Amino acid sequence: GSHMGTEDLKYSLERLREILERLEENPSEKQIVEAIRAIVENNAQIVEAIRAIVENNAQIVENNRAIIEALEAIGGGTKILEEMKKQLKDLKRSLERG
Amino acid sequence: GSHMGTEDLKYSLERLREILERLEENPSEKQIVEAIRAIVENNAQIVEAIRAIVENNAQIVENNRAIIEALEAIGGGTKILEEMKKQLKDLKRSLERG
Amino acid sequence: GSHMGTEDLKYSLERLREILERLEENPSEKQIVEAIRAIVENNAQIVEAIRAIVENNAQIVENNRAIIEALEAIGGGTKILEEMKKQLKDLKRSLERG
């Protein structure tokens, strides 16, 4: 699995903090570059973490549509059909984004 | 549409990577500032990407409530009413956050 | 509440922008470190904002499962049971991630 945890992001930034503190205490070209490096890598980690979450969210959206279809089946003939079908289409719209 | 894709974030960071590599190979005031600039802009892109996603998530939460109301209708008289109504309120709580 | 708003992230980055602009206009060791500092802090804010959102999303996933159980109850005997139960398990999988 390529899924990244929220805690994983935190731990990476804790290291970044250390580097920052070292930079502030003893400003230098080395510490500046190392600080930037860590930030650049961490930025990727954040996006990658978001990616996995978004992909999961997409599955949830699809799952939500499955509920509607099942609901409309057993609720067949009930007014709710008029509005629940509209929601399904809206979920599809969301499904195609991420 | 102002929606930003996950891939869009990646591509921006790929450019950032290039700048980092140039910085590391040839440290300089120019490369430092340019690296920082790219990071600052990319940070905005991440938040803006999150914004759109969160706004979509808010709509999903509202949509989830719509399912409950439709469900409670056809399930009227069924015990589930006691608990499903509690969920709806919880979804509302989430709806008002983002 | 420890929940952070999307707007909160924006406002922080607006300050970061100002620092960047000052850096670009007058490059200096001071502005470089201050720019990095702000970025490091803002990176934490982004992750913390994500954390709260993800935790909320987890609750939504659980809530979605509650809908299924209520649906399956009133729809008992209906074919939908075969597929809706599969979704519930998939939601559980998502619930255990974040």
Side-chain angles (χ1 to χ4, degrees):
Chain A
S2 66
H3 190 285
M4 181 178 292
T6 302
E7 290 179 352
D8 293 338
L9 296 175
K10 182 176 185 285
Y11 290 128
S12 292
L13 291 181
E14 287 181 356
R15 172 64 173 171
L16 178 58
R17 176 178 171 167
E18 178 185 353
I19 293 168
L20 173 63
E21 290 175 356
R22 289 177 185 277
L23 173 64
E24 289 176 356
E25 288 178 355
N26 296 282
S28 66
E29 289 177 353
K30 180 178 178 180
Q31 287 297 323
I32 290 166
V33 171
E34 287 296 327
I36 291 167
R37 179 185 65 75
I39 291 166
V40 171
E41 293 171 7
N42 289 338
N43 286 340
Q45 290 177 32
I46 291 169
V47 171
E48 286 295 338
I50 291 168
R51 180 184 62 77
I53 292 166
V54 168
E55 289 172 359
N56 288 342
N57 285 342
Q59 291 178 329
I60 291 169
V61 169
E62 184 176 2
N63 285 343
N64 286 340
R65 292 172 69 199
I67 290 169
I68 293 171
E69 289 177 354
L71 179 62
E72 290 183 359
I74 67 170
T78 304
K79 183 175 172 65
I80 62 172
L81 292 176
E82 291 170 337
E83 295 296 303
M84 291 310 304
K85 289 183 183 303
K86 293 175 186 173
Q87 181 188 328
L88 189 153
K89 290 178 181 178
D90 189 59
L91 288 172
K92 183 179 186 295
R93 179 181 62 82
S94 294
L95 190 59
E96 295 179 1
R97 297 291 182 271
Chain B
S2 66
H3 190 285
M4 181 178 292
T6 302
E7 290 178 352
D8 293 338
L9 295 175
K10 182 176 185 285
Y11 290 127
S12 292
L13 290 181
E14 287 181 356
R15 172 64 173 171
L16 178 58
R17 176 178 171 167
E18 178 185 353
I19 293 168
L20 173 63
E21 290 175 356
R22 289 177 185 277
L23 173 64
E24 289 176 356
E25 288 178 355
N26 296 282
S28 66
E29 289 177 353
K30 180 178 178 180
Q31 287 297 323
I32 290 166
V33 171
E34 287 296 327
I36 291 167
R37 179 185 65 75
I39 291 166
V40 171
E41 293 171 7
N42 289 338
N43 286 341
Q45 290 177 32
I46 291 168
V47 171
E48 286 295 338
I50 291 168
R51 180 184 62 77
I53 292 166
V54 168
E55 289 172 359
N56 287 342
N57 285 342
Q59 291 178 329
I60 292 169
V61 169
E62 184 176 2
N63 285 343
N64 286 340
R65 292 172 69 199
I67 290 169
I68 294 171
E69 289 177 354
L71 179 62
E72 290 183 359
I74 67 170
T78 304
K79 183 175 172 65
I80 62 172
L81 292 176
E82 291 170 337
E83 295 296 304
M84 291 310 304
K85 289 183 183 303
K86 293 175 186 173
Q87 181 188 328
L88 189 153
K89 290 178 181 178
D90 189 59
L91 288 172
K92 183 179 186 295
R93 179 181 62 82
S94 294
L95 190 59
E96 295 179 1
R97 297 291 182 271
Chain C
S2 66
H3 190 285
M4 181 178 292
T6 302
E7 290 179 352
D8 293 338
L9 296 175
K10 182 176 185 285
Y11 290 127
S12 292
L13 291 181
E14 287 181 356
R15 172 64 173 171
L16 178 58
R17 176 178 171 167
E18 178 185 354
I19 293 168
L20 173 63
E21 290 175 356
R22 289 177 185 277
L23 173 64
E24 289 176 356
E25 288 178 355
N26 296 282
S28 66
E29 289 177 353
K30 180 178 178 180
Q31 287 297 323
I32 290 166
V33 171
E34 287 296 327
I36 291 167
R37 179 185 65 75
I39 291 166
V40 171
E41 293 171 7
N42 289 338
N43 286 341
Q45 290 177 32
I46 291 169
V47 171
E48 286 295 338
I50 290 168
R51 180 184 62 77
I53 292 166
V54 168
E55 289 172 359
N56 287 342
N57 285 342
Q59 291 178 329
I60 291 169
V61 169
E62 184 176 2
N63 285 343
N64 286 340
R65 292 172 69 199
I67 290 169
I68 294 171
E69 289 177 354
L71 179 62
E72 290 183 359
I74 67 170
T78 304
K79 183 175 172 65
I80 62 172
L81 292 176
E82 291 170 337
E83 295 296 303
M84 291 310 304
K85 289 183 183 303
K86 293 175 186 173
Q87 181 188 328
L88 189 153
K89 290 178 181 178
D90 189 59
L91 288 172
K92 183 179 186 295
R93 179 181 62 82
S94 294
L95 190 59
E96 295 179 1
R97 297 291 182 271

